[PDB]
Amino acid sequence: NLYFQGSQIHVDTMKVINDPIHGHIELHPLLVRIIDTPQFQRLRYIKQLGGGYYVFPGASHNRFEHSLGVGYLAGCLVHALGEKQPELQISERDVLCVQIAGLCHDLGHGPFSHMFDGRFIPLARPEVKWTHEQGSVMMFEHLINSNGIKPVMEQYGLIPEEDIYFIKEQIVGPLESLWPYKGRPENKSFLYEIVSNKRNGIDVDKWDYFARDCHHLGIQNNFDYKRFIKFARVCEVDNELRICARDKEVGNLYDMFHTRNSLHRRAYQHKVGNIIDTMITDAFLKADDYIEITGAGGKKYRISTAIDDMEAYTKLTDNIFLEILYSTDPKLKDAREILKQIEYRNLFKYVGETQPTGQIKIKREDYESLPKEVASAKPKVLLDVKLKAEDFIVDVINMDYGMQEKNPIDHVSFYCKTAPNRAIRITKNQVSQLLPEKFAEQLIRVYCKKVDRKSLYAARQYFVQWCADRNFTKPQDGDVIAPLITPQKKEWN
Amino acid sequence: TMKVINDPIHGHIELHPLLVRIIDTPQFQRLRYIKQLGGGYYVFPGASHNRFEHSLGVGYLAGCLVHALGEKQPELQISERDVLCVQIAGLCHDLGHGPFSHMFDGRFIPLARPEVKWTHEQGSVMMFEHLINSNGIKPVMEQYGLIPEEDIYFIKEQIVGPLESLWPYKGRPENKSFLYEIVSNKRNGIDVDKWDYFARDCHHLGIQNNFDYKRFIKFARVCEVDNELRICARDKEVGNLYDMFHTRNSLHRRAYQHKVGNIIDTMITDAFLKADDYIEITGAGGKKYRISTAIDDMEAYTKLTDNIFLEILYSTDPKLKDAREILKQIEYRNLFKYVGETQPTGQIKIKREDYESLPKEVASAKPKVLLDVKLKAEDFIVDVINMDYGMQEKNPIDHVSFYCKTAPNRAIRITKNQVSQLLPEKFAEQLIRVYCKKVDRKSLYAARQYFVQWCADRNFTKPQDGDVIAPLITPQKKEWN
Amino acid sequence: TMKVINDPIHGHIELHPLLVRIIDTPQFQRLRYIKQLGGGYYVFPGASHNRFEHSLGVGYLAGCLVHALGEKQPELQISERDVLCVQIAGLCHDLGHGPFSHMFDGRFIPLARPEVKWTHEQGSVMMFEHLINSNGIKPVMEQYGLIPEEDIYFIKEQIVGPLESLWPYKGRPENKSFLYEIVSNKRNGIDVDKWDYFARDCHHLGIQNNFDYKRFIKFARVCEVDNELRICARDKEVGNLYDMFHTRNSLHRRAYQHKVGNIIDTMITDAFLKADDYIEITGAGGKKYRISTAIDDMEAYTKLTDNIFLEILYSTDPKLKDAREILKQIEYRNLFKYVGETQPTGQIKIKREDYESLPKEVASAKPKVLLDVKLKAEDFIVDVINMDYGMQEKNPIDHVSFYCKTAPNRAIRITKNQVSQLLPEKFAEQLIRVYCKKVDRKSLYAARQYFVQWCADRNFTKPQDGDVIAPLITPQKKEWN
Amino acid sequence: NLYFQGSQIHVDTMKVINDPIHGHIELHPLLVRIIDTPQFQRLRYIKQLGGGYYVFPGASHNRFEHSLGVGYLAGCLVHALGEKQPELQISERDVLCVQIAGLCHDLGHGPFSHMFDGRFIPLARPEVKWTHEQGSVMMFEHLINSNGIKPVMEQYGLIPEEDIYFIKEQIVGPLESLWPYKGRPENKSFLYEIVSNKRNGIDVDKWDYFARDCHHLGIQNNFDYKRFIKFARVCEVDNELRICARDKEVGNLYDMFHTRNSLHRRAYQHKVGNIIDTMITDAFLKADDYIEITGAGGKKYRISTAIDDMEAYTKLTDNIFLEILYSTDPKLKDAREILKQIEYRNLFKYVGETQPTGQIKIKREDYESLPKEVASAKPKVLLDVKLKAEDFIVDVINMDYGMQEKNPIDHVSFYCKTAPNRAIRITKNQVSQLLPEKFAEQLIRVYCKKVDRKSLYAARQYFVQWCADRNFTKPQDGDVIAPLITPQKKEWN
Ligand SMILES: O=c1ccn([C@H]2C[C@H](O)[C@@H](COP(=O)(O)OP(=O)(O)OP(=O)(O)O)O2)c(=O)[nH]1
Ligand SMILES: O=c1ccn([C@H]2C[C@H](O)[C@@H](COP(=O)(O)OP(=O)(O)OP(=O)(O)O)O2)c(=O)[nH]1
Ligand SMILES: O=c1ccn([C@H]2C[C@H](O)[C@@H](COP(=O)(O)OP(=O)(O)OP(=O)(O)O)O2)c(=O)[nH]1
Ligand SMILES: [Mg+2]
Ligand SMILES: [Mg+2]
Ligand SMILES: [Mg+2]
Ligand SMILES: [Mg+2]
């Protein structure tokens, strides 16, 4: 009932949601429509850090709130780039599409997030190749079709067939195979760098999880994403328009990847968190033959096969832990007993950690053979117990800056104050001699399933002996856990 | 050996091995699967926190407060045994919570089993007993200087209050009265439970905490008050104490009684009610229990957590269709529609006996408006919320004792007018929310007319949006104009 | 080119080059040498923050609020020029503050020059004029679309209110009324100045902020209210608005009116008074001014900051001995002694005309106690503190307009009883603090007897520690017992 | 008036102070007595970060509040060590002494903290050798004697002559010259590691300033000192009792020194902060002949000579900046004009940054010769302006982990879970290949005092040419600021 320039004013109030990390943020009605579906709401029942909650009691946060944050930040970054550079022709349609991809990027996560595709599926179905990101595309497709989203998209200026395709590309990368993307052209290349940056890992996903995980873990975040946004521009790089950082921010960019690595070190790869994920996975494996999840047209699926049917997969969340824990079926006894051990805190025992020494790298094809190697070590110590291959767990952890051996800053372009449209490169030695010399390494953790004092003492001797035999690094507590073993190795002394 | 645990609220804290032994049981670990704020998570996406981490915090703060009091006043004879007992009570105070915390004993049980009288605190005693017995805790207690018979009893008293119908406690004597004020303070509500949840809930909700518990601890002493030794606050902290209860009230207002959070709890409860006949939880000796009867068997109750929401949601049993359909409406965000809020005006108070009759009153209002729809009693929900400073009509500060700088052993009282004229003049009130289960535009417009008419008829306060939602109704009431 | 600056409160914020040009002047940079909370730093060691950083924050938030309103409502015709003008007013609002901020115009000037009538806001207009003229800002303003004559006038109006004795503003018309509510809101006190100082002062003080300004911005709109376009709050935010003023009051209570902070301000002011005849500040054309007369010359006033405390402290001039000795007492922490606090009881209000006569009243009280010491009027300090919600006796929420979800263009009013019965029943009160300049045990004991006797005689409230500090006095008053 | 076991109870209420960093903390009356003196209160008028406030508007904090924090944390750490290990025989006297040293460690700072002893004194009086820590001893002595503290110390169980000596040793290190300390013996060696740790830099001073500076700067702290305290013990190391860290905290210790370095990088060595300190120092130098500070017995001192008289030095704070700024004396015109340039933000112009390349290190004896080298470079660029030695400032910044070239973790001892009384060493390669390979480097900043566009463009050409001539690293913006210069160097391309 109000008019301006002779035309009626229309008031479209956005939904406002209060997030502890980002504060009060506005959700466009199209995002709301996507959020309020069983497919998206599912993420409320999947813990961001999986078993981490069993080590960090503040880490009760789920994928849901993280996904909201990623959608929000994606919008924030695209908007800012567009406000500073109208010449990029960023439309509200483009903004929505990037927001949606941010929201939906984690739709394919299973129970306990990275445990599911990182540990469980590879063991439960070695023939398949599965990733949560592929799952996110399938789940996104299912969300769209089951909830009649296409008309709603059209209503807000989206072109579904193109934009749905674009969204999927933002999530999983190129869907085929020159410029490998179809949803958007080279001059909007920078749009593909926002949610999931496959080129250098600088994206808003990190920005949310740094801040969110820190808030819940009780570890403090030292990366400033708002600063980064202020010092980001889009410049021409080899015929694409790409996000570039202000040159003097290079220190802060190295620090961003240092933060990521510290979080993996302190929290995500916590030695006990990992053994809890291991044990949960063992329980799932022992339960997989007996639990039934009903999918499309009444078909029955297993935990390991629910990934093949999005209707079933929709019902596959952290709930499965409790279904197992609370079960009475005798056939689930073995699974159930593992989870009960978790509850009584009768966990597999951490033996130690070591690393390879040279340019030596442990191949994934050889992971399975490692426990046997440990059991076959011959420590010159008098022991009450003999341990077998099956008593040992050997967990190999790849720690890196997100691109294996590569320095991600070598794949970043910068701009200078005096020529803010000119992209440049900055090399490592131009920056600082105090930076890492390598960008990838492996940590090897060894655990023992025999938890008594005598078995643990024995396991330590086998472990350190194995380290010596393989020319691995001297464990940090080596002289304490295995004083009779460490002298033999003079490379260690 | 003790353990160090990192909590986001309290930082790195130490857990005595006896506490670890109690924590690492199915009975305690259960609290990982029960959301602190229940349906609140469906309005505040940061509110994913569970009772578990809150219980750790309460146990920690209980220890902190007892230790500080003991360090400053050796004459109180606070032993490490005393410290452990208070820590255990802090840890175990919430053991009796059910699915979605206060939804369970606040909404579900009263509807599902009106004959019984159940509280989470009673549940905590039963669950604590079950925890002790099922996990062989008594020997461990003895190993660390506790005397189980006495101390178990003491712990239960700290949780639920006096265990019988003059000093009413057996676990500890009058000269350690102050130990009963730490976990759950029945006298004035100043306890460490609040201190943890203020800070924790604020951290997760994205609302800032304005109470400083560490300051309070520095300005706390134990003084003689009528043959008891009681916690007393420094006199000049009286302002900050009023602010503590103001903070509590603001958190209820903004978050815990959020109009949508409450309707989600309502809907979840409806789903539980429609599921209760069909879900089976196996308890002691294979006996079968229902959601509503699991409170009678701690073995079954151990397996009754927020999981039940998802068991219902993921079920295929045709008998669970109705329950399942309510939860699906939650997921699609097809929620009951908020109509409005009002309050009583005078000394008038709505009795709980009459809550059930209210939707009928609303449906029977006769708005002088032409409507396309007629609504019935069953289309309305009337949610009556009691908001207070923790002791009904009473000012809790009237039950606080203070000490002065010049005589720190002398307990005194401070009255309200000695403090500030800007403080509340009353300490309890009721909020009345009305919702409609018919969600279409026409029904909602009708519901608004019935509601405002009802407010007028009952001499309740004018709804804030009254002139907008019911312009034809508001003029009739000149007390409103 | 614009600049990015990192503020701990607001993070990385952008400064338009015109704001930079204004910031980088001696007149603005001056604010780096004036503590926000004055003597507060001597009680709260984190409160080292200056007016400078606060002014940056206010300028930033002013821009934020105007921008948000404009983005949601293009029909308001908010221009970048308008944004700049509001930002400048935010930046420059505190230009007129003197040494130790509110101590200067609150305590010093009224004592040093009782004939004049001076406020920091008037000072800000004069200093703003001086800043513009001395730094050739007008051409720069023009370069960025401002119209100096009009916009300078507008800026001054935003700072000090209407510049004359019906729409009383010239800088902008009724349809941009809302622009005058942003920096300094004379109508209801809801402005961005509060928003910055809540957050900033809390950060430095070590007291937590419980107001959410970002939420407020999301629930703010501009609606027609009597031919003006005014900022309106969403109706359901009324609770949060009351809490905003509660927060203000708690900060005054805990920090800004801290009994020791105030006595430090008092003592500093005494030192300034004893120094005023002897310190020389060179102003325009070499003319000499005093601390008390520097307000008459902006060139001199530019050089009048917290530095004056240290000029006095470090001086050797025998004529400054008395001033210097007061500051040394501050350093040795030989402060005047706090005796107690009381309040008036009825509708009774202490007039400012009578403040000067109060120490004499205290000295003339006749306590029925045998004392070793007789105290005189000059041994007592009586500090009367007006505590209110910003508009004397008035409820500021009565001067707020709201909008409802179903009609977001329609401004409405909400009354107090429509909200909550737990809110204040009055919005102003007075606190009376009494101190003694005689610091020995015997004098202090005597002062307490005089004070409590005086409270009894005047029918003031019973001091909180009354029975402890003056046990022989309190029984006489049975209104107290 | 209350009794227990027949004896009167005495209630000694400590003063409580609210600090934003540490919260409500208790001050022992002896600390209060020391705090409430002109010598200590002086620290309220000296900014922690000096010129930093002119770049970071939140950095208004003074040495005073930092000193309170250090005193508090010193007490916290000593108390915790003593609570866990009664066998160390830590007394309340020991606690007080460490608290006092923490409080008083910064008493010797001058105007703008590190500017004074880092920049001003070395220029104003090159013959002398002065450090703030030496100043802190002298000021501490003056504080004690002028305020009659010795009797108060005795009253609380201190033995002044021994303990005063001990306090001074904690502040400045050994006062002479085997075990080089006299205040306490080898079995309380760990007490010397608390306030100022000369062996490996792990002390409570860092812990306070990390947290405090971060709070004011608007940069977030990522070090957790409370965690460290929980994982700290005292163990026998080469006949001393020394503070040892839990072995698995080694990652977090490396991160502690990384945090320190990031703070220097982002904030303390900010290129503009440093030029402001430079300019302030220039102003002091031009004022030094004309400002008079009255010391003991009416004697007159200068800014540069006030360090010789503690009574004068007591009156030498950040106030001197404003005395200069507000002065009218024609003789102070030149000083005053520099400060006015600061206020108008007419600052010397940043030209660029480079580093040495090899194991090459720029000697301090050669710093003075550098501007001349820059001015003598011969860029093959056509310029409107010729610049001289005096137009250039060359600021050489030593960035390191606190012990020059050394890895501080090589001077840390650790303990293991299974043997918490046994000290061990952990080497760099036992930890991680992603850590720094070097622990020290130099940054070379160049500035120009001629601020016009033409002079600045010229300065850039001289600078980059100089970098090329010296085989220094290619400036990050080199191709942008000096495109005609960079091609000549093929080591750069
Ligand atoms: O005082 C409050 C009230 C709500 N919230 C949160 C809860 C939620 O995440 C967001 C939106 O809540 P609000 O109550 O504003 O939304 P609503 O219930 O959808 O209200 P309406 O639909 O009437 O606008 O703000 C707060 O942080 N503070
Ligand atoms: O890593 C940093 C660097 C600077 N600052 C702060 C200091 C200041 O308040 C704001 C701007 O600093 P910056 O160094 O980006 O500005 P500049 O020195 O003016 O750089 P240039 O003029 O080269 O853009 O950011 C940070 O918070 N973090
Ligand atoms: O509500 C308050 C009051 C004071 N303070 C701070 C100021 C100071 O840093 C510390 C101590 O202040 P308090 O008012 O308790 O001390 P006092 O004035 O010395 O009171 P008294 O001497 O009566 O104990 O607490 C707060 O943080 N909150
Ligand atoms: Mg809503
Ligand atoms: Mg462990
Ligand atoms: Mg700059
Ligand atoms: Mg005091």
mmCIF file of N, CA and C and ligand atoms in Angstrom, chain B residues 215 219 234 236-237 240 405, chain C residues 43-45 205-207 253-254 258-260, chain D residues 15-19 24, ligand 3:
data_model
loop_
_atom_site.group_PDB
_atom_site.id
_atom_site.type_symbol
_atom_site.label_atom_id
_atom_site.label_comp_id
_atom_site.label_asym_id
_atom_site.label_seq_id
_atom_site.Cartn_x
_atom_site.Cartn_y
_atom_site.Cartn_z
ATOM 1 N N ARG B 215 34.142 -13.704 38.939
ATOM 2 C CA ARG B 215 34.072 -12.562 39.859
ATOM 3 C C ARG B 215 33.301 -12.989 41.090
ATOM 4 N N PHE B 219 34.273 -13.027 45.296
ATOM 5 C CA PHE B 219 33.524 -12.237 46.260
ATOM 6 C C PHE B 219 32.532 -13.097 47.012
ATOM 7 N N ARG B 234 29.707 -10.773 48.782
ATOM 8 C CA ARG B 234 30.064 -9.400 49.133
ATOM 9 C C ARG B 234 28.887 -8.462 48.869
ATOM 10 N N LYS B 236 28.466 -5.351 47.958
ATOM 11 C CA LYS B 236 28.396 -4.494 46.767
ATOM 12 C C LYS B 236 28.134 -5.272 45.468
ATOM 13 N N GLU B 237 28.238 -6.601 45.532
ATOM 14 C CA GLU B 237 27.858 -7.488 44.423
ATOM 15 C C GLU B 237 26.358 -7.718 44.260
ATOM 16 N N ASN B 240 25.142 -7.057 40.771
ATOM 17 C CA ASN B 240 25.517 -8.157 39.893
ATOM 18 C C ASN B 240 24.681 -9.429 40.091
ATOM 19 N N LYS B 405 32.842 -5.367 53.800
ATOM 20 C CA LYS B 405 34.296 -5.245 53.800
ATOM 21 C C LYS B 405 34.858 -5.170 55.224
ATOM 22 N N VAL C 43 41.097 2.269 37.643
ATOM 23 C CA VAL C 43 40.359 1.174 38.323
ATOM 24 C C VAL C 43 40.325 -0.100 37.459
ATOM 25 N N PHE C 44 40.148 0.095 36.152
ATOM 26 C CA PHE C 44 40.136 -0.967 35.148
ATOM 27 C C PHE C 44 41.368 -0.884 34.261
ATOM 28 N N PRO C 45 42.388 -1.720 34.507
ATOM 29 C CA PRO C 45 43.622 -1.548 33.781
ATOM 30 C C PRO C 45 43.541 -1.822 32.282
ATOM 31 N N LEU C 205 37.262 -3.201 29.293
ATOM 32 C CA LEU C 205 36.971 -3.296 30.700
ATOM 33 C C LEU C 205 37.105 -4.733 31.248
ATOM 34 N N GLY C 206 36.869 -5.734 30.406
ATOM 35 C CA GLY C 206 36.750 -7.110 30.887
ATOM 36 C C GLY C 206 35.363 -7.402 31.443
ATOM 37 N N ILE C 207 34.360 -6.705 30.929
ATOM 38 C CA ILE C 207 32.957 -6.989 31.197
ATOM 39 C C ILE C 207 32.365 -7.345 29.854
ATOM 40 N N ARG C 253 26.686 1.440 36.157
ATOM 41 C CA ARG C 253 26.707 0.912 37.496
ATOM 42 C C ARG C 253 28.018 0.237 37.828
ATOM 43 N N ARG C 254 28.488 -0.633 36.946
ATOM 44 C CA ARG C 254 29.684 -1.409 37.218
ATOM 45 C C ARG C 254 30.970 -0.623 36.986
ATOM 46 N N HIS C 258 31.865 3.862 38.843
ATOM 47 C CA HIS C 258 32.573 3.124 39.885
ATOM 48 C C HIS C 258 32.983 4.117 40.986
ATOM 49 N N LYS C 259 32.704 3.763 42.236
ATOM 50 C CA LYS C 259 32.895 4.689 43.368
ATOM 51 C C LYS C 259 34.324 5.210 43.482
ATOM 52 N N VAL C 260 35.290 4.362 43.176
ATOM 53 C CA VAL C 260 36.690 4.764 43.131
ATOM 54 C C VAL C 260 37.082 5.526 41.846
ATOM 55 N N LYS D 15 43.583 -7.695 47.405
ATOM 56 C CA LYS D 15 42.959 -6.810 46.432
ATOM 57 C C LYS D 15 42.705 -7.659 45.194
ATOM 58 N N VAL D 16 41.538 -7.445 44.612
ATOM 59 C CA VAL D 16 41.161 -8.084 43.362
ATOM 60 C C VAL D 16 41.131 -7.000 42.270
ATOM 61 N N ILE D 17 41.731 -7.323 41.133
ATOM 62 C CA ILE D 17 41.759 -6.447 39.962
ATOM 63 C C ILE D 17 41.246 -7.204 38.735
ATOM 64 N N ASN D 18 40.411 -6.531 37.945
ATOM 65 C CA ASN D 18 39.860 -7.113 36.718
ATOM 66 C C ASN D 18 40.674 -6.708 35.491
ATOM 67 N N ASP D 19 41.362 -7.686 34.929
ATOM 68 C CA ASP D 19 42.091 -7.511 33.708
ATOM 69 C C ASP D 19 41.299 -8.181 32.562
ATOM 70 N N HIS D 24 39.591 -11.705 36.729
ATOM 71 C CA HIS D 24 39.755 -11.240 38.097
ATOM 72 C C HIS D 24 40.904 -11.938 38.742
HETATM 73 O O1 LIG E 3 31.032 -4.841 38.860
HETATM 74 C C1 LIG E 3 32.285 -4.667 38.785
HETATM 75 C C2 LIG E 3 32.957 -3.826 39.679
HETATM 76 C C3 LIG E 3 34.325 -3.661 39.575
HETATM 77 N N1 LIG E 3 34.989 -4.281 38.587
HETATM 78 C C4 LIG E 3 36.423 -4.240 38.455
HETATM 79 C C5 LIG E 3 37.192 -2.946 38.689
HETATM 80 C C6 LIG E 3 38.460 -3.438 39.334
HETATM 81 O O2 LIG E 3 39.458 -3.752 38.387
HETATM 82 C C7 LIG E 3 38.058 -4.711 40.078
HETATM 83 C C8 LIG E 3 37.869 -4.433 41.556
HETATM 84 O O3 LIG E 3 36.794 -3.539 41.718
HETATM 85 P P1 LIG E 3 35.946 -3.460 43.052
HETATM 86 O O4 LIG E 3 34.825 -2.510 42.839
HETATM 87 O O5 LIG E 3 35.573 -4.885 43.463
HETATM 88 O O6 LIG E 3 37.121 -2.986 44.087
HETATM 89 P P2 LIG E 3 37.069 -1.745 45.133
HETATM 90 O O7 LIG E 3 36.489 -0.496 44.539
HETATM 91 O O8 LIG E 3 38.516 -1.703 45.510
HETATM 92 O O9 LIG E 3 36.002 -2.198 46.244
HETATM 93 P P3 LIG E 3 36.304 -2.495 47.848
HETATM 94 O O10 LIG E 3 37.638 -1.851 48.119
HETATM 95 O O11 LIG E 3 35.059 -1.983 48.440
HETATM 96 O O12 LIG E 3 36.391 -3.991 47.875
HETATM 97 O O13 LIG E 3 36.801 -5.155 39.502
HETATM 98 C C9 LIG E 3 34.283 -5.138 37.710
HETATM 99 O O14 LIG E 3 34.884 -5.749 36.815
HETATM 100 N N2 LIG E 3 32.971 -5.296 37.833
#
